[PDB]
RNA sequence: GGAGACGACGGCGGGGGCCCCGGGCAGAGUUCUCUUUUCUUCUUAACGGUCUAUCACCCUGGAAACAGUUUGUCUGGAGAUA
């Protein structure tokens, strides 16, 4: 698992041909936003810290890559 | 604040001087290379220090390394930050310009 | 009804001992009918199998170490004085040996001896 | 040789050898008021 | 006499040496017992009755 | 300069007429201790009632809601209601006095 | 040529776990009287990134009015202190 702090690199990782899964984590107690992408051999997580950039990133992610929000109380 | 870079100063190579207090401090002991140049970010409290092979970006509010950028160069001569703060230009003695 | 099986499965699923599992006496029939770890979880949720709380447990120097500590503090004080320039190298060495010997007993005594030496 | 970015003063910082000199060059843009403000900025950390 | 009775009830429930007991929030209690105790203290009983 | 707002909710017991709000307030008045001694009811800890049936406490020291719950249990079983009433923290600083679950017969 | 590849003991120091003490949240227990009360939860793996060091080694320089230094010992022109 690797950390990402740059949005363009997260975009290119998501555009990689083997980018398998994606999810968005919102931690409201620490007002933090994470975008996690599963890209075969690593899991990458971008730390955003801002909701405006979170929305812009969600709009800018590739359409084929189905972005989704992870729910509470995982089954 | 004004920062000075002395290549042969070893662990005293980079020094930030606060003029309002006449205080010279050396915040970053380890630099992983011979320091060549340094600059302040245009709109955010980050410090770029360029040694012979890399440029290390340091947040000054935490005094912590936030980034390392590695131009494909042998001996970095100069660098410059965009007024925007998201692009770099690196000129090196290997006759190669690198836009980052 | 025999409830050894239910006792063991309930302890295993509740992560406690067999002495901490409690089966409802009035519902022995339903507990006996339960014979799977999903049915026993259903009973645990329903309140017929209960994990009891833990039992109340109400709670309400060698001369080697002395010498080591006194030597460390004395040597630290000599280092501080020699670094602050109160003493010089040779008087520092003299005090070093004299304190290694049982001449000094405490920091203040060292201090008055330094006063006598310098005055 | 580098200039102090602020327009409120006229301060030049040079590095020769192992020394850094902060200087006030004589230029027909420095008023008496601008000069005194610059000198106050320089000798404002002597406290 | 009431003090002696309450002491007797307490020592009756106490047991000797540190036995783990079922919590009240886990155990359930009957309407008959609740109504009896309440009207011993003097509580009008039409308040309760639907409950559970 | 920090103040504390504690709420004791005995609305249901008061409506059922099993809990005396005035008696409970008096009980807290004698038993709340400030500097290791009871009766030091200065401008440190204050106590009042609202007309709807709850007790409000404004604490300036470090009165712990655990102490408030402990005194609540004290009064409840002093009136002999411990076996049939419990105190549940339903909010940040609101302790509600409700009934234990009841099985029909 | 290295690693694999290595004895026993002693005290000393660093670090991680356990034990202990306090505050806070939630719950449970005693309570004729007393006890701002007693007990329980408060946890974070592999792997990856980054920062962190005793020994050791290097440069300047040249020490007795000998110095450095450990709980102890000792080290130093075969280059100490700094």
């Amino acid at each position: 698992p690797q950390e990402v702090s740059d949005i363009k690199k997260f975009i290119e990782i998501c555009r990689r041909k083997d980018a398998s899964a994606a999810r968005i984590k919102k931690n409201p107690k620490t007002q933090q936003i994470k975008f996690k992408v599963r890209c075969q051999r690593f899991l990458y997580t971008l730390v955003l810290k801002d909701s405006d950039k979170a929305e812009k990133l969600k709009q800018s992610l590739p359409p084929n890559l189905q972005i989704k929000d992870v729910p509470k109380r995982n089954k | 604040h004004f920062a000075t870079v002395s290549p042969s100063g070893q662990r005293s190579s980079v020094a930030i001087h606060t003029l309002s207090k006449h205080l010279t401090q050396i915040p970053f002991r380890k630099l992983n290379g011979l320091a060549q140049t340094a600059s302040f970010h245009p709109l955010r409290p980050l410090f770029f220090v360029a040694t012979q092979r890399s440029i290390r970006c340091y947040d000054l509010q935490k005094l912590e390394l936030v980034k390392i950028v590695q131009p494909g160069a042998k001996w970095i001569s100069s660098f410059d930050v965009h007024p925007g703060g998201d692009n770099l230009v690196v000129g090196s003695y290997d006759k190669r310009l690198l836009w980052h | 009804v025999n409830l050894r099986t239910q006792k063991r499965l309930a302890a295993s699923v509740l992560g406690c001992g067999e002495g901490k599992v409690w089966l409802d006496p009035n519902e022995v029939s339903e507990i006996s009918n339960a014979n799977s770890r999903q049915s026993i979880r259903k009973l645990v949720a329903d309140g017929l199998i209960i994990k009891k709380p833990v039992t109340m447990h109400s709670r309400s120097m060698p001369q080697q170490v002395l010498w080591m500590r006194r030597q460390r503090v004395l040597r630290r004080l000599l280092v501080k004085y020699r670094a602050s320039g109160k003493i010089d190298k040779h008087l520092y060495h003299e005090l070093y040996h004299l304190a290694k010997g049982n001449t000094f007993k405490h920091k203040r005594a060292l201090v008055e001896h330094i006063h006598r030496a310098k005055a | 040789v580098r200039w102090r970015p602020t327009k409120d003063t006229f301060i030049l910082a040079a590095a020769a050898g192992e020394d850094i000199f902060l200087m006030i060059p004589t230029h027909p843009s420095v008023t008496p008021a601008l000069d005194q403000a610059s000198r106050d900025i320089l000798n404002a950390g002597f406290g | 006499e009431q003090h002696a009775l309450i002491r007797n009830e307490a020592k009756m429930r106490k047991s000797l040496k540190n036995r783990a007991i079922i919590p009240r929030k886990a155990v359930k209690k009957p309407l008959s017992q609740l109504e009896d105790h309440l009207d011993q203290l003097g509580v009008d009983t039409e308040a309760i009755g639907l409950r559970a | 300069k920090v103040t504390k707002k504690f709420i004791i909710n005995a609305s249901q017991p008061a409506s059922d007429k099993i809990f005396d709000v005035s008696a409970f307030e008096k009980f807290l008045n004698e038993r709340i201790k400030v500097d290791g001694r009871v009766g030091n009811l200065g401008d440190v800890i204050k106590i009042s009632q609202i007309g709807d049936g709850k007790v409000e406490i404004i604490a300036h020291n470090d009165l712990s809601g655990r102490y408030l719950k402990y005194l609540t249990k004290k009064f409840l079983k002093k009136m002999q209601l411990r076996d049939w009433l419990r105190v549940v923290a339903t909010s940040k600083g609101v302790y509600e006095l409700k009934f234990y679950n009841i099985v029909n017969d």
Side-chain angles (χ1 to χ4, degrees), chain C residues 97-115:
Chain C
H97 273 310
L98 192 45
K100 184 178 184 293
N102 279 291
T103 306
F104 294 100
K105 180 67 174 66
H106 60 96
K107 181 174 72 68
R108 296 177 186 174
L110 202 76
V111 176
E112 290 91 8
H113 203 287
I114 295 154
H115 292 93

Side-chain angles (χ1 to χ4, degrees), chain A residues 2-48:
Chain A
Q2 304 202 19
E3 174 151 32
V4 182
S5 65
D6 51 354
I7 297 89
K8 284 212 151 83
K9 186 180 289 293
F10 193 79
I11 300 299
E12 66 92 21
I13 297 169
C14 286
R15 293 181 184 271
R16 214 173 271 131
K17 67 170 73 175
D18 54 349
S20 290
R23 54 211 161 271
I24 297 169
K25 264 292 281 163
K26 307 179 296 330
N27 300 350
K29 164 145 203 75
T30 187
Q31 63 85 30
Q32 202 185 353
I33 306 294
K34 295 186 178 180
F35 278 61
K36 316 183 187 215
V37 68
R38 181 73 205 178
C39 183
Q40 184 78 77
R41 184 283 185 176
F42 286 103
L43 180 72
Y44 303 82
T45 186
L46 177 65
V47 185
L48 279 78

Side-chain angles (χ1 to χ4, degrees), chain C residues 22 50 52-53, chain E residues 20-27:
Chain C
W22 174 83
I50 283 172
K52 282 176 287 204
Chain E
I21 59 171
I22 302 165
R24 286 182 187 100
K25 69 178 182 179
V27 72

Side-chain angles (χ1 to χ4, degrees), chain E residues 32-48:
Chain E
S32 170
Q33 311 264 340
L34 183 63
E35 179 258 313
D36 183 73
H37 203 131
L38 273 192
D39 77 348
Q40 302 224 30
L41 282 72
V43 177
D44 187 76
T45 81
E46 300 66 20
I48 60 173

Side-chain angles (χ1 to χ4, degrees), chain B residues 3-7 13-15 31 33-40 47-58 75-81 89-91 93, chain D residues 2:
Chain B
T4 181
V5 172
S6 66
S13 300
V14 60
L31 273 189
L34 297 175
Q36 293 323 339
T37 300
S39 292
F40 287 91
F47 200 39
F48 297 75
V49 172
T51 77
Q52 269 160 27
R53 297 253 164 105
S54 73
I55 297 89
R56 314 152 72 75
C57 190
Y58 287 129
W75 204 336
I76 294 175
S77 179
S78 295
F79 68 94
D80 184 307
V81 299
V89 285
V90 176
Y93 294 109
Chain D
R2 282 290 180 297

Side-chain angles (χ1 to χ4, degrees), chain B residues 53-73:
Chain B
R53 297 253 164 105
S54 73
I55 297 89
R56 314 152 72 75
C57 190
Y58 287 129
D59 188 0
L60 294 174
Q61 319 169 287
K62 296 183 290 294
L63 301 198
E64 294 293 328
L65 189 146
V66 298
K67 197 176 290 294
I68 300 143
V69 295
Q70 295 288 145

Side-chain angles (χ1 to χ4, degrees), chain E residues 6 24-25 28-34 37-38 41-44 47 51-52, chain F residues 12 15-18 79-84 86 99-105:
Chain E
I6 193 66
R24 286 182 187 100
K25 69 178 182 179
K28 294 181 176 67
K29 296 177 178 182
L31 279 168
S32 170
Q33 311 264 340
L34 183 63
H37 203 131
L38 273 192
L41 282 72
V43 177
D44 187 76
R51 308 305 204 256
Chain F
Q12 183 66 41
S15 302
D16 301 329
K17 184 262 290 181
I18 68 174
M79 294 299 291
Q80 285 178 5
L81 290 202
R82 178 81 158 87
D83 291 331
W84 319 92
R86 75 177 300 198
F99 283 70
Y100 286 109
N101 308 350
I102 299 168
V103 57
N104 201 318
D105 61 299

Side-chain angles (χ1 to χ4, degrees), chain A residues 47-65:
Chain A
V47 185
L48 279 78
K49 187 268 183 181
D50 191 14
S51 297
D52 288 334
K53 267 81 75 177
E55 179 65 27
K56 169 145 192 53
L57 183 63
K58 184 178 184 293
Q59 295 159 345
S60 66
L61 294 174
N64 287 70
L65 186 149

